[PDB]
């Protein structure tokens with residue numbers, strides 16, 4: 001069925017599925033206890049998150065879940081990327097086992113910390129969040145990975161408020177895009193997507209940078225919805241004409257100019273992740 005990969009395999013007898021965390025796209029995610037998944041402590045149970053198919057799964061859903069698991073393998077480890085811990089790939093349903101982030105996705109996290117007009121985000125927190133995600137994305141870029149679905153909803157927050165890029169279902173090696181074919185990039189959410197991904201059917205690191213701009217806007221509006229009141233059907237005409245989202249209130253001119261830089265029409269005129277990391281480092285240090 002699936003070719004065995006001993007390096008990553010995890011005994012099913014050692015995994016105890018628990019309460020569900022939620023559902024979307026090609027899968028479901030449940031909380032679980034894994035005994036000895038940290039090999040240095042073979043009798044310790046760790047709380048983990050298990051991604052598996054839903055009952056109404058399609059062939060494509062399975063393909064996507066396999067693709068995500070395989071991608072997590074190719075990427076290697078980093079503090080701001082959700083860690084693959086192992087997989088049950090043999091003699092039963094596909095379980096992809098990830099490190100557990102207790103606080104769920106960043107969009108809901110930020111929305112829950114909006115003031116009345118479960119605590120409050122400081123400016124420094126927002127910049128920190130942004131910086132962590134830039135570092136994650138820089139590392140990703142260096143591993144030849146394009147994520148293609150960057151967005152607040154695809155970031156998980158740990159118990160200690162560490163930001164972890166997640167949901168690698170759409171992620172590709174940079175060389176594994178079907179350039180110029182009309183079906184290419186057809187499953188990317190339009191409001192986070194670089195124009196060239198649609199108009200040219202390509203996807204480079206600079207396309208991810210565009211998405212990161214949108215994510216920055218989400219962060220600074222505390223989980224606001226991009227292009228409020230503009231239907232998806234009308235976006236791409238407005239973008240060709242040079243329309244861009246206005247500056248969020250609790251955001252500096254400098255950080256807004258960085259967003260606008262990520263949204264440069266010309267992909268090559270956008271900053272790299274490395275430049276974003278350096279700039280955010282400087283700003284975070286100063287605050």
Ligand SMILES: */C=C/C(=O)N1CCC(c2ccc(-c3nc(Nc4cc(C)n[nH]4)cc(N4CCN(C)CC4)n3)cc2)CC1
Pocket residue numbers: 021022023024025026027028029049050051082098099100101102103104105156166167168169
């Ligand atoms: C469509 C893209 C895609 O691949 N999916 C859609 C969204 C689905 C989803 C993912 C994650 C959660 C989720 N996860 C966690 N923790 C977690 C998950 C992982 C892999 N590691 N840690 C926690 C939560 N919550 C929900 C509300 N609780 C109050 C807090 C914890 N939710 C849900 C859905 C995946 C597939």
Ligand code: NA
Pocket residue numbers: 054055056057058
């Ligand atoms: Na089914």
